[PDB]
RNA sequence: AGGGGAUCGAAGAUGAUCAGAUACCGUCGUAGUCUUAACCAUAAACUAUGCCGACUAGGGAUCGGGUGGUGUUUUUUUAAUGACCCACUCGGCACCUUACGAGAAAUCAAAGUCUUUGGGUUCUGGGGGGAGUAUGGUCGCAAGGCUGAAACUUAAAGGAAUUG
């Protein structure tokens, strides 16, 4: 947050899970952060460039991490018809 | 699954589900056009009879009641209406 | 003692107290 | 000398990590207590109580002492550690290493009209350990920490000045009461609030930018 | 505390089971709770077969068998080198040896 | 039997949001369910939702963003006086800066913040945060 | 429903249920039944006066081995005989 | 009993770990050589190590021994690790795809040589 | 996106089908596996190899995105994947773990076998649960080769394959190595066949 | 209160054991056990878990009904049925895994959606004894059932797990 005159307070604004919009707490050890590489016209990965996906430990514990990343990766252009909205 | 189109289920899934548990419930029965031998006298029967339906002119047999779908006669032509 | 036989002991006692009290009315 | 053996420990000596919130942001596990000492040198420790636990054996009872120690600077960080040892001094020393490894941030907020310097908790929070339930409610200015002396000074070391408290269960169990309060304060950052609804670019973990300073 | 989920027996939706008598001590025990064992043995022995063959007309007769269903109570089974006692985690296994 | 259809509507939303589901189906889609949902969506707590018109009562498919923490009904619907809203706001809202005690008044269904502006109170329906 | 009625017209059931259930409270039961007025040899009063009738050497319970030096007093206002303690070292000599 | 302790066993295994192209299957040579490559504070222990080394050498002569890796067997075991066939078991010898698999082939927009054989319950 | 040269080539579908990578498990099915395609008679479910390939490429992109090759860890306890992981670590940094896992290789920072990987690759989640369980303690992503009945808890992007057969297990390890090398640029030509024989990653019983 | 009364068998009689043994073991054996008409109204009558309603994780099996499949076998190779196999489904008795969650724990798919405390409703409890006792009612032929205290006394009784 912040006080009446700018001066942002509440240090450490935390991350939110990509698949659930849920805060990844500082003690969540099941949560992971996936980095997937990019390619430029040659099939060679560009070092230092990633599409980053953060998943909370709740979905990973429920077995829905794999499915949620299929939806997440398909709609970012780096995947294909493996995932379908209509189940 | 945590995400899915609950508004447009596939026709395969709606086919398997119970009639009351589809997106909008509807009957899975139908009506037939029975070709009784002899006179044309086309008769309409339900998929589930609950009664021994017989033709108006020659009322021998057209279908027999059953726990589920009605059983048509041995010699008979039919088309779903 | 067993709760079963404390139930039995008290019932016998209530028999007599229902009988000695009948000697007066 | 420290000579750590951990990827996170190597980054601390290299100086690539300067704020402990950078550890909190990426949920990096802490397995070496010198990381907390290097990042947070201003934390203070104190022991609530020492109690003897005894094991029945073929020849007499085996007495050991349980040490409950709370660490943390008075600005936004606390850690709670519990350890048993056959000596009281050894348990207290070992109960400080555990306490530092579990340092967590507290989300402070205002009871209203945010003039500045958050003086209370942002939201209602609760923590349950065993039968003990500890509830914390934001309080106006000057009301202090309305709590029992054991719970109060844990909140004093958290940087919270004004708060209300309600307790349940066998609160005379000091170990579970502090564990229930430690859960409640840690939950202040797990509660999503409308001012945190904004999206973020999901920054890259420091373990990738500084991979050259790893073990290999 | 509750030792077992079934609590001794196989009664879930029966109400009453109309018990049977123990074959060793005549104790009454509900049939589901009983420890039924089936005893199927040859008519003579594994040792008398050698002498009952040549001393028999109708060579290789049948070697017939005896069939008997035995019921034991909880006490009679434990005392007879049967289902005696297991550990807390071994108690949950229902597979025969 | 079904006593209140709003409780089943809100409990299904809570159970859906606990698992992380982006959507949930609500039956049988009363009016006050729509009015309650419209307030939640006005403040950005649910998002889009869809009404399915079967001929009996209707169904609702609600798209759920991850912003919602708890929606609940208050049963019975107590009569809330104008000065007692601060009491209800105090008991069952997380903080003084966010959260709405949705109550039904003669001027439609609206949260306590809008009720204060209009200076009108009524019966309490529920809460959202 | 977690037990108790919640209906907005269920005030009588809740009020009567609480009234019936308060009789399990020792203080509520003792106060309304008037046990202090009809028992507890005082008349519900803090102090009372009487006449010493005997000097008693009541022996303490276990684990404890001593003699307590109590007295037997008959209340003036009621006439009931009660036992009272004479607390201090050597104060039984003033209450002959 | 004649069960040998870890001191007899670990030392015997360590010698074999690095002295295979060395001391043979004979105890007399074994004990005359172990005291030259390793120092032991007592003769009784030095005899047990040489006796167990002789015993473990014989087990090596007939197949490998689990937990023992000397210079000669690790290079031989890795030498056969690159062995590859010439038939190319994944290469086509004629492929047989069932009816359901045949539906997969054309669905992906790919043409393959297929010999469909029906399979039924 | 992709330059559209990463699609399933006709020769790739030869190896997948000749190795029977498309033959999934029996009617026992997990709801977390929509990769099933047109269940065959006799109960066998045919896996959509088109989904296997695209998922396999996604796994390879993640492996090539890790700054250090040695921070990848390949774990296989099954006897059919013990050879495959070792040679996967022959052509890639990918520090391997073949055989037992030694519970405490990711926690217990003082242990001899301590490793700190940024990604873990496992063959069978069911038999490799100990590796998967500890990865949930130190914020480590996990890539698995999941059959149609394999568990999917704490498992990130997974490659649907046939873990029952030895031909399918080794082929996926062979494939994954080939694409990660291509993404890194070691294999200069995308259309090159990588003459290294696919039966290199294939277990031998003697 | 009639009928019936084989078997087993409160009581009782006996043999034995025992320091004693009016018990356990053995042999007899009355009431009872069985039935008809009428009472009794209890039980660890237990799932020690009130009823109605909604939602929340996976898996197989089974019972009843239904649907589909050129599916297998018997009639009349051949149809329909019947019995099996595969898929789905509604309802039931349960079962396996896990812990999102709950619990003091044992454990629990409900004993979950309960300090982020409210779907509807019924009943019961308020430290351990005295005590389910006294007394007064009411029901029963009786045995007894239901309702049900107080004086007094006490600092612990009690639940689940831990190590001996
Ligand atoms: Mg209390
Ligand atoms: Mg017991
Ligand atoms: Mg009303
Ligand atoms: Mg005492
Ligand atoms: Mg009763
Ligand atoms: Mg019963
Ligand atoms: Mg069923
Ligand atoms: Mg069925
Ligand atoms: Mg049933
Ligand atoms: Mg009380
Ligand atoms: Mg009481
Ligand atoms: Mg106990």
Residue numbers in the entry:
A (entry chain AV): 1 to 87
B (entry chain Ab): 2 to 82
C (entry chain Bm): 1 to 25
D (entry chain AC): 34 to 249
E (entry chain Aa): 2 to 98
F (entry chain AW): 2 to 130
G (entry chain AX): 2 to 97
H (entry chain AR): 2 to 95, 100 to 126
Provide text from the study:
In addition to disomes, these samples contained 80S monosomes, most likely as a result of background dissociation activity; these 80S monosomes adopted the POST-state with RQT bound in the same position on the 40S subunit as in the disome. High-resolution refinement of the RQT-bound ribosome classes followed by local refinement of the isolated RQT densities resulted in a resolution ranging from 3.5 Å in the Slh1 core region to 7.5 Å in the peripheral regions of state C1. When bound to the ribosome, Slh1 adopted a bi-lobed arch-like architecture formed by the two RecA-WH-Sec63 cassettes. The N-terminal cassette (NTC) is clamped between the body and the head at the mRNA entry site of the 40S subunit, stretching from helix 16 (h16) of 18S rRNA along the array of ribosomal proteins (r-proteins) eS10, uS3 and uS10. The C-terminal cassette (CTC) is packed on the NTC and connects the RQT complex with RACK1 (Asc1) at the back side of the 40S head. Densities for both Cue3 and Rqt4 were positioned between the two cassettes with Cue3 binding to the upper convex surface and Rqt4 packing against the concave side of the Slh1 arch close to uS10. In C1, the HhH forms additional contacts to eS30, another protein lining the mRNA entry path located in the 40S body near rRNA h16. Moreover, in the C1 conformation, direct entry for the mRNA into the NTC helicase core, as observed in the Ski-complex, would be obstructed by rRNA h16 that resides at the interface of RecA1 and RecA2, occupying the space where RNA would exit the helicase. In addition, in the C1 conformation, the helicase core of the NTC is in a constricted conformation, mostly resembling the apo/unengaged states of Brr2 and other related Ski2-like helicases. After recruitment, RQT stably locks onto the 40S of the stalled/lead ribosome in the C1 conformation via the Slh1 NTC, placing the Slh1 CTC in a position primed to bind the 3′ region of the mRNA emerging from the ribosomal mRNA entry site.
